Design an enzyme around this catalytic site. Structure first.
Site, PDB file in Angstrom:
ATOM      1  N   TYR A 152      65.884-108.622 -29.199  1.00  0.00           N
ATOM      2  CA  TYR A 152      66.595-107.958 -29.618  1.00  0.00           C
ATOM      3  C   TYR A 152      68.092-108.171 -29.337  1.00  0.00           C
ATOM      4  O   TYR A 152      68.648-108.788 -28.217  1.00  0.00           O
ATOM      5  CB  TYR A 152      65.910-106.198 -28.941  1.00  0.00           C
ATOM      6  CG  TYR A 152      66.585-106.023 -27.640  1.00  0.00           C
ATOM      7  CD1 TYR A 152      65.821-106.059 -26.756  1.00  0.00           C
ATOM      8  CD2 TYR A 152      67.989-105.985 -27.263  1.00  0.00           C
ATOM      9  CE1 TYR A 152      65.993-106.600 -25.121  1.00  0.00           C
ATOM     10  CE2 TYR A 152      68.295-105.438 -25.970  1.00  0.00           C
ATOM     11  CZ  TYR A 152      67.278-105.927 -24.338  1.00  0.00           C
ATOM     12  OH  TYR A 152      68.079-105.614 -23.473  1.00  0.00           O
ATOM     13  N   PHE A 175      76.203-105.014 -27.030  1.00  0.00           N
ATOM     14  CA  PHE A 175      76.040-104.657 -25.598  1.00  0.00           C
ATOM     15  C   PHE A 175      75.045-105.327 -24.947  1.00  0.00           C
ATOM     16  O   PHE A 175      74.817-104.920 -23.723  1.00  0.00           O
ATOM     17  CB  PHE A 175      76.600-102.832 -26.019  1.00  0.00           C
ATOM     18  CG  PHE A 175      75.156-102.534 -26.571  1.00  0.00           C
ATOM     19  CD1 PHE A 175      74.338-102.361 -25.691  1.00  0.00           C
ATOM     20  CD2 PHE A 175      75.768-101.902 -27.851  1.00  0.00           C
ATOM     21  CE1 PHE A 175      73.269-101.717 -26.278  1.00  0.00           C
ATOM     22  CE2 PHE A 175      74.046-101.810 -28.359  1.00  0.00           C
ATOM     23  CZ  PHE A 175      73.132-100.899 -27.659  1.00  0.00           C
ATOM     24  N   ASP A 176      73.866-105.871 -25.691  1.00  0.00           N
ATOM     25  CA  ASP A 176      72.321-106.285 -25.217  1.00  0.00           C
ATOM     26  C   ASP A 176      72.126-107.559 -26.231  1.00  0.00           C
ATOM     27  O   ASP A 176      71.997-107.607 -27.417  1.00  0.00           O
ATOM     28  CB  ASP A 176      71.760-105.373 -24.819  1.00  0.00           C
ATOM     29  CG  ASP A 176      70.631-105.083 -24.004  1.00  0.00           C
ATOM     30  OD1 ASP A 176      70.237-106.692 -23.603  1.00  0.00           O
ATOM     31  OD2 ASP A 176      69.846-104.568 -23.360  1.00  0.00           O
ATOM     32  N   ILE A 227      64.198 -95.869 -25.470  1.00  0.00           N
ATOM     33  CA  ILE A 227      64.133 -94.775 -25.586  1.00  0.00           C
ATOM     34  C   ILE A 227      63.604 -94.434 -26.456  1.00  0.00           C
ATOM     35  O   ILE A 227      62.753 -95.649 -27.472  1.00  0.00           O
ATOM     36  CB  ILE A 227      65.840 -94.706 -26.304  1.00  0.00           C
ATOM     37  CG1 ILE A 227      66.274 -96.404 -27.167  1.00  0.00           C
ATOM     38  CG2 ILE A 227      66.342 -94.997 -25.042  1.00  0.00           C
ATOM     39  CD1 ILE A 227      66.987 -96.404 -27.510  1.00  0.00           C
ATOM     40  N   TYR A 285      70.891 -92.688 -25.618  1.00  0.00           N
ATOM     41  CA  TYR A 285      71.165 -92.140 -24.451  1.00  0.00           C
ATOM     42  C   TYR A 285      72.019 -91.033 -25.043  1.00  0.00           C
ATOM     43  O   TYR A 285      71.823 -89.989 -23.402  1.00  0.00           O
ATOM     44  CB  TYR A 285      72.204 -93.153 -23.725  1.00  0.00           C
ATOM     45  CG  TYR A 285      71.463 -94.391 -23.714  1.00  0.00           C
ATOM     46  CD1 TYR A 285      70.028 -94.281 -22.201  1.00  0.00           C
ATOM     47  CD2 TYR A 285      71.900 -95.292 -23.888  1.00  0.00           C
ATOM     48  CE1 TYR A 285      69.431 -95.523 -21.600  1.00  0.00           C
ATOM     49  CE2 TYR A 285      70.910 -96.667 -23.685  1.00  0.00           C
ATOM     50  CZ  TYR A 285      69.653 -96.601 -22.289  1.00  0.00           C
ATOM     51  OH  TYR A 285      69.167 -97.845 -21.702  1.00  0.00           O
ATOM     52  N   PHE A 324      69.869-102.301 -33.427  1.00  0.00           N
ATOM     53  CA  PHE A 324      69.756-102.840 -33.297  1.00  0.00           C
ATOM     54  C   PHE A 324      68.949-103.911 -34.129  1.00  0.00           C
ATOM     55  O   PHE A 324      68.396-103.428 -35.337  1.00  0.00           O
ATOM     56  CB  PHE A 324      68.357-102.294 -32.179  1.00  0.00           C
ATOM     57  CG  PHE A 324      68.744-101.464 -30.813  1.00  0.00           C
ATOM     58  CD1 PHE A 324      68.908-102.672 -29.529  1.00  0.00           C
ATOM     59  CD2 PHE A 324      69.052 -99.847 -30.674  1.00  0.00           C
ATOM     60  CE1 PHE A 324      69.598-101.808 -28.165  1.00  0.00           C
ATOM     61  CE2 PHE A 324      69.073 -99.687 -29.301  1.00  0.00           C
ATOM     62  CZ  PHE A 324      69.567-100.551 -28.716  1.00  0.00           C
TER      63      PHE A 324
END
Lengths: 49, 48, 107
Positions: free
Chosen positions: C26, C36-37, C56, C82, C99
């Protein structure tokens, strides 16, 4: 506010020596057609797609 | 900008993209594997 | 707010089941487009079990709707994400999360 850093792949562009446009009095034709056939594609050769 | 096509997928092997340019409108159009792409570029600059 | 779009098709017949570990790659981006990831940066697939609330909701629902070998874009509202609290430093409050998920295999 802070400068951001990330790793990105290099990208390159390729064209045929074909140039067509529109102008008043132009000798060129207006409608054009071409095709591109994909043979091999690696979705993720690196972390970037 | 997303565009809708049958069997919509990212460019994959054996895919054929047909690009059409009309300078009169002006308009740019695409077909994927002989299927229409439901989006067009138009009314763009003709300076070059 | 889980909304799934298919970037590349999968088998279309095998889907994740509860108690079945999902292995994915991902890349995480906020709606404005900031990453961010990414599991690919670490070069290690991310494994998570369904129904254990480890990930999540956005993931829980999206991967379930997804299929083996499938690549998809998941857009997740803050509530499923979140949320108002956010992830300090990483994720701002009230942020929609985008994502790109490739579901490698199920185990």
């Amino acid at each position: 506010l802070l400068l951001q850093t990330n790793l990105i792949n290099y990208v390159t562009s390729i064209r045929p020596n074909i140039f067509v446009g529109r102008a008043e009095g132009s000798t060129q034709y207006g409608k054009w057609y071409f095709e591109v056939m994909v043979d091999e594609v690696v979705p993720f050769l690196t972390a970037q797609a | 900008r997303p565009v809708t096509s049958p069997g919509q997928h990212l460019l994959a092997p054996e895919d054929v993209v047909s690009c059409c340019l009309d300078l009169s409108v002006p308009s740019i159009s695409f077909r994927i594997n002989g299927c229409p792409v439901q989006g067009v570029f138009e009314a763009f600059n003709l300076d070059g | 707010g889980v909304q799934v779009e298919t970037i590349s098709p999968g088998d279309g017949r095998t889907f994740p089941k509860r108690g079945q570990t999902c292995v994915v790659h991902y890349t995480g981006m906020l709606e404005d487009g900031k990453k961010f990831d990414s599991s690919r940066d670490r070069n290690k697939p991310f494994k998570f079990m369904l129904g254990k609330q480890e990930v999540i909701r956005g993931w829980e629902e999206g991967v379930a709707q997804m299929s083996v070998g499938q690549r998809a874009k998941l857009t997740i509202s803050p509530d499923y994400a979140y949320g108002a609290t956010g992830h300090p430093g990483i994720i701002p409050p009230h942020a929609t999360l985008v994502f790109d998920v490739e579901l490698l295999k199920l185990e």
